[PDB]
Design a protein around this nucleic acid. Structure first.
Length: 607
RNA sequence: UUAA
C-alpha cells in the first residue's frame, strides 16, 4: 500500500510494486498516493488491456500530440477515432494529474471494428476477452491505430497530411519473381515491423539495437508461395518519428537482455546507398548528405507478473523549455511516477520485454507541446443544428449570447445500461454504460433564464439491456431512423458542445454533475462547477432532488419519468436559492432544517 | 444515498 511508487527492487527477479496489478477502481477512489506528477494517468476500467499504454506513448510525441489536439479547432465529426483521440489528448493535458478515462475513445474503436488486409479489424475486435494480452497484439494495434489515423487524416477539413509526413516510411517492395524481371510496389507504411528474423548478426559490430532497425529497413528474404519467390524491401525515407513494432522470440528475447545498454538513447544516421544503417553518433558515416539525429521519445514494455499476469507500461521522455533537460516518466495504469534515465532504459529484468519502441527527431522532440486554445476554434454547433433524425420546447442560442468565461447555465444528462457487473473472475468488473440524453438550459439572469438550448438524444446502435426510465427519460426509440419523437444526433457532436463550454469557461450547475461528466467522459475544473449535491451536503446522506424540490420550495418532481429538461431546471433555481440563503447569514440555520425534519420523516414525504 |  504505502510504498507502491517504488520502481526498483534489489533482486533482478522481483517485480517492483509500481509494475503490478493495481486494485480495481470500479466510488471516490483516491488517486493521490498513486500519482504525484502533473501528468494524468488513465482509468483501467476499459475493455482493452493494451490500448491504455499506447495512448500514453503517443500523448508525448510533440508532433503527433500537437496535431491531434490541433484538429479540435475544426468540427471533424466523421473522423471518429482522431477527434475522440483529440478530446482525450486535450483532456489529459489539462487535468494535470487528475484521473482520466479513455471510455469514449474505446467506444469509437469498437464502433469501427464492428463495421466490417481487412483482417486487422477482426483481430483487433478481441475487445471481448483480453492471459490478458497475447503476443504481438500491441504491435498489431500500434499499426492499426496509426493506419486508421492517417486514413482519417485525409478526411479532415482542409485535408492535412501531417501524420504521414512523420510516420511515412516509403517502402520499396521489389519482388524478384523472375531473373532480369522484377515487380516492385511502393507502399507508405506508418510503422516498421521488426518481426520473424533468421540467423542474424547480433554479436559483432556492437550488440546494440541499431542493426535491428537496419535489417528491417534493408532486407530481402527467400520464402514465399510452389515458387519460393524472393522479394526486396528497402526504405528511402528517414521520417520525423519511427514507430518500431518489436516482435521477437523468447529465445532471442533473453539474449538481448544480457547485452548491457542494448537500447540507444540517441542515434544519428542517413542513407548512403539505397540501404540504410545508422551509427551510435559514433561518426561512422562513409559519405554524407542530409543528416538526421534521433533521440528516443518513449516506448511500451510488457510486464510479466510474479504471479504470471501480464500488463503493459509506458516509459516516456519529456523536454523542459526552461532548462535543457530530459525528465523520464513511467505509466502504469493510474500509477505515474518520475524515474531516472538509467532505470528507464535498463533491460536486465527478465519480467520486462519491449513491445513498441518509438524514436523521434531530436530538434522536434525539444519542440514544445501546444494547447488547442493556442488556436481559435469553430464554436458553430453551439448556434447551429446538426440532427441525424427526422424530427422538446427549447430555444437555440444567438450570437449576442456569446458564452464567456463564467456563464452560469445548468446541465443534466441521462444514460442507459448495456452490460452489468460481469464480475467474480478475479473478485472482471462492471464495464459498460452509455449516455442517451443531455440538456443544457440557460441560467444567466435575464429574459432568457431557465430556458433550454440543447436537448439532444444521442445515437446508439449497440445492444441495450436496461432502459429504466423510472430514472432516465429515454423513450425506447433511441435508434437513428425510428426517432422516439426526439432529435437524435451523434455522440461526437454533443460532446463538442459540452467540450466547447468548459473550454471557454462556462459554469455548470446541477445535481451530482461530476457523475454526469464521468459518463459523458469529460473533466471540468473544480472551480467551474456548482454542484447542489455538494452545497446541501451534511457530511454524508446525499439528499434527493425530488425531496428538495418538495422540501425547499413547492414543486413535486417525483414519480414522473425523470425528464432531464426539468431536473436541470430544478437544479438551476436551487443554486439560486442556495445563493439567497448564503448572501443572508442563514446558511446552516436553514441547512439543519430538513435533514433534521427528514430523519423524523424518513427522508421521503408524500408525493 | 445522491446519481442514474
Amino acid at each position: 500500500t504505502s510504498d507502491i511508487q517504488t520502481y526498483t527492487s534489489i533482486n533482478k527477479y522481483e517485480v517492483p510494486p509500481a509494475y503490478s496489478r493495481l486494485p480495481l477502481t470500479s466510488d471516490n477512489f483516491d488517486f493521490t498516493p498513486f500519482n504525484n506528477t502533473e501528468y494524468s494517468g488513465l482509468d483501467p476500467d476499459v475493455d482493452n488491456h493494451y490500448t491504455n499504454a499506447i495512448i500514453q506513448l503517443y500523448r508525448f510525441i510533440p508532433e503527433m500530440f500537437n496535431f491531434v489536439v490541433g484538429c479540435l479547432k475544426d468540427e471533424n465529426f466523421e473522423t471518429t477515432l482522431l477527434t475522440d483521440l483529440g478530446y482525450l489528448f486535450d483532456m489529459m493535458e489539462r487535468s494535470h494529474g487528475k484521473i482520466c478515462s479513455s471510455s469514449n475513445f474505446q467506444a469509437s474503436l469498437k464502433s469501427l471494428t464492428d463495421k466490417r488486409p481487412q483482417e486487422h479489424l477482426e483481430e483487433y475486435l478481441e475487445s471481448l476477452c483480453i492471459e490478458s494480452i497475447k503476443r504481438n497484439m500491441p504491435q498489431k494495434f500500434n499499426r492499426f491505430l496509426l493506419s486508421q489515423l492517417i486514413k482519417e487524416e485525409a478526411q479532415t477539413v482542409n485535408h492535412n497530411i501531417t501524420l504521414n509526413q512523420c510516420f511515412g516510411l516509403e517502402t520499396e517492395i521489389r519482388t524478384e519473381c523472375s531473373c532480369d524481371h522484377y515487380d516492385t510496389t511502393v507502399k507508405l507504411l506508418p510503422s516498421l515491423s521488426i518481426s520473424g528474423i533468421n540467423k542474424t548478426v547480433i554479436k559483432q559490430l556492437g550488440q546494440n539495437i541499431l542493426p535491428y532497425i537496419e535489417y528491417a529497413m534493408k532486407n530481402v528474404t527467400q520464402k514465399n508461395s510452389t515458387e519460393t519467390i524472393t522479394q526486396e524491401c528497402t526504405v528511402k525515407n528517414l521520417p520525423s518519428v519511427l514507430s518500431l513494432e518489436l516482435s521477437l522470440l523468447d529465445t532471442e528475447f533473453s539474449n538481448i537482455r544480457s547485452s548491457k545498454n542494448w537500447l540507444t538513447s540517441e542515434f544519428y544516421g542517413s542513407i548512403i546507398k539505397n540501404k540504410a544503417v545508422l551509427r551510435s553518433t559514433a561518426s561512422e558515416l562513409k559519405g554524407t548528405s542530409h543528416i538526421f539525429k534521433y533521440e528516443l521519445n518513449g516506448y511500451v514494455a510488457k510486464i510479466t507478473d510474479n504471479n504470471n499476469e501480464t500488463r503493459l507500461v509506458t516509459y516516456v521522455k519529456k523536454y523542459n523549455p526552461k532548462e535543457n533537460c530530459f525528465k523520464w516518466l513511467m505509466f502504469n495504469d493510474y500509477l505515474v511516477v518520475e524515474i531516472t534515465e538509467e532505470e528507464a532504459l535498463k533491460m536486465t529484468y527478465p519480467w520486462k520485454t519491449p513491445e513498441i519502441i518509438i524514436y523521434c527527431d531530436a530538434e522536434e522532440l525539444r519542440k514544445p507541446f501546444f494547447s488547442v486554445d493556442t488556436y481559435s476554434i469553430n464554436y458553430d454547433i453551439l448556434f447551429r443544428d446538426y440532427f441525424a433524425n427526422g424530427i422538446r420546447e427549447y430555444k437555440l442560442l444567438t450570437h449576442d449570447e456569446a458564452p464567456k468565461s463564467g456563464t452560469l447555465v445548468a446541465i443534466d444528462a441521462a444514460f442507459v445500461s448495456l452490460q452489468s457487473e460481469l464480475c467474480e473472475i478475479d473478485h472482471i468488473r462492471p464495464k459498460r454504460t452509455a449516455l442517451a440524453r443531455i440538456s443544457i438550459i440557460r441560467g444567466e439572469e435575464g429574459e432568457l433564464y431557465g430556458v433550454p438550448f440543447v436537448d439532444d438524444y444521442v445515437v446508439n446502435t449497440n445492444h441495450i439491456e436496461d432502459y429504466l426510465t423510472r430514472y432516465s427519460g429515454i423513450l425506447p426509440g433511441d435508434l437513428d431512423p425510428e426517432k422516439s419523437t426526439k432529435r437524435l444526433v451523434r455522440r461526437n457532436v454533443v460532446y463538442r458542445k459540452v467540450w466547447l463550454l468548459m473550454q471557454l469557461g462556462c459554469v455548470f450547475v446541477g445535481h451530482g454533475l461530476n457523475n454526469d461528466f464521468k459518463h459523458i467522459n469529460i473533466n471540468v475544473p473544480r472551480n467551474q462547477i456548482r454542484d447542489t449535491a455538494i452545497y446541501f451536503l451534511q457530511g454524508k446522506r446525499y439528499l434527493s432532488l425530488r425531496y428538495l424540490a418538495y422540501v425547499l420550495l413547492g414543486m413535486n418532481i417525483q414519480e414522473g419519468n425523470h425528464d432531464s429538461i426539468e431536473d436541470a431546471h430544478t437544479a438551476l433555481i436551487l443554486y439560486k436559492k442556495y445563493l439567497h440563503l448564503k448572501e443572508k447569514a442563514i446558511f446552516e440555520k436553514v441547512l439543519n432544517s430538513v435533514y433534521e425534519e427528514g430523519r423524523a420523516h424518513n427522508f421521503k414525504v408524500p408525493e
